[PDB]
Design a binder for this molecule. Structure first.
Ligand SMILES: Nc1nc(C[C@H]2C[C@H](O)[C@@H](COP(=O)(O)OP(=O)(O)OP(=O)(O)O)O2)c(NC=O)c(=O)[nH]1
Ligand SMILES: [Ca+2]
Ligand SMILES: [Ca+2]
Ligand SMILES: [Ca+2]
Ligand code: NA
Ligand code: NA
Ligand code: NA
Ligand code: NA
Ligand code: NA
Length: 320
DNA sequence: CCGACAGCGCATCAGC
DNA sequence: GCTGATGCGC
DNA sequence: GTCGG
């Protein structure tokens, strides 16, 4: 295994994102951690690791130091830095990003209690993130996701039989647990060339006391909180997103939001090699000089695989 | 050597 | 009142 | 921090 290395790299990633405000270093560290986590041998040297794409000179050196000492001095200094620790912690609140965390810590607001004492300094999203701080960090067992899917699919049908709703994310690929629930919604009345379609669904889910809180809500995206009904101890509150997509872009959306991200990458690269470009909304043909044509008609995920002459992959086999 | 690294919907705010 | 920038999360 | 033009 290599859990020591990947943990180190993930801790560095979070430092770069939250304290340094260096999103590309965060992603570099994450990329390195992901390739190493997938590698099938306990790494013995930085040089060994550097053969992996995304591992370069600096991470190789850190791996050598970790392997020889069991720690990383850089990290030890970071862990001991009270300001970096406080900023890092605060960003665990949903809605508190690196900018708000630093600002809070600058004026002595460092702990959950400080936030609770200063709730007037929080915006709506941040107040909800604080409210469900522990709940949002729990994962969702598939059994509960299954029960949540039932409620969402049933309530959407009650509003209008011609809504189509798909629960995507790792759950759709068959994951044993999920971090949140991602619902993609469409309706034949809503296309690229074409009121309250999302609102009526959100409202119905509120009226049945499934949706408990709203982080943000517009005409095409809802971000909020939900909870399964209990008999017993109550269930944790869960993040749920519902995205309203035009029907002619729906299956491209289902494809994208199902992932995995690695899978999307490889599928887009294969599409190109066949003269097509796929993004979150459309698949378009590429001309001989590389000009994208008009979007192609898509009535199913399968249609997309067909265009690029790929055998349809079950969502279950889309980890890569 | 050095620019790219994903980018968009919603909430919020500074500026007009 | 509005627009455009930006933080934020995904 | 890493990669590739
Ligand atoms: N995680 C993530 N997702 C998206 C949207 C797309 C791309 C990703 O391949 C697909 C699945 O993302 P998701 O957040 O569901 O991660 P998931 O794969 O579900 O893991 P889990 O945490 O176990 O539920 O949604 C992002 N971009 C835009 O939504 C993003 O920044 N982060
Ligand atoms: Ca998700
Ligand atoms: Ca996720
Ligand atoms: Ca709870
Ligand atoms: Na946060
Ligand atoms: Na029907
Ligand atoms: Na989450
Ligand atoms: Na080729
Ligand atoms: Na380039």
């Amino acid at each position: 295994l290599n859990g020591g290395i990947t943990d180190m790299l993930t801790e560095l990633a979070n430092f770069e994102k939250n304290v340094s405000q260096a999103i590309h270093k965060y992603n570099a560290y994450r990329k390195a951690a992901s390739v190493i986590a997938k590698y099938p041998h306990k790494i013995k040297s930085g040089a060994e690791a550097k053969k992996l794409p995304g591992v370069g000179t600096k991470i190789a050196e850190k791996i050598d130091e970790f392997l020889a000492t069991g720690k990383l001095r850089k990290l030890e200094k970071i862990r001991q830095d009270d300001t970096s620790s406080s900023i890092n912690f605060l960003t665990r609140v949903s809605g508190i990003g690196p900018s708000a965390a630093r600002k809070f810590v600058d004026e002595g607001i460092k702990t959950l209690e400080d936030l609770r004492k200063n709730e007037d300094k929080l915006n709506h999203h941040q107040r909800i993130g604080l409210k469900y701080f522990g709940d949002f960090e729990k994962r969702i067992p598939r059994e509960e996701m299954l029960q949540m899917q039932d409620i969402v699919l049933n309530e959407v049908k009650k509003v209008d039989s011609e809504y189509i709703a798909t629960v995507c994310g790792s759950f759709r690929r068959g994951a044993e647990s999920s971090g949140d629930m991602d619902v993609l919604l469409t309706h034949p009345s809503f296309t690229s060339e074409s009121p309250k379609l999302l609102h009526q669904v959100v409202e119905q889910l509120q009226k049945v006391h499934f949706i408990t809180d709203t982080l943000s809500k517009g005409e095409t995206k809802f971000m909020g909180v939900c909870q399964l009904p209990s008999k017993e101890k109550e269930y944790p509150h869960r993040r749920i997103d519902i995205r309203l997509i035009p029907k002619d872009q729906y299956y491209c959306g289902v494809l994208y939001f199902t992932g995995s991200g690695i899978f999307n990458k490889n599928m887009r690269a294969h599409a190109l090699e066949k003269g097509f470009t796929i993004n979150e909304y459309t698949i378009r043909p590429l001309g001989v000089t590389g000009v994208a044509g008009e979007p192609l008609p898509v009535d199913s995920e399968k249609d997309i695989f067909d265009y690029i002459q790929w055998k349809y992959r079950e969502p279950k086999d889309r980890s890569e």
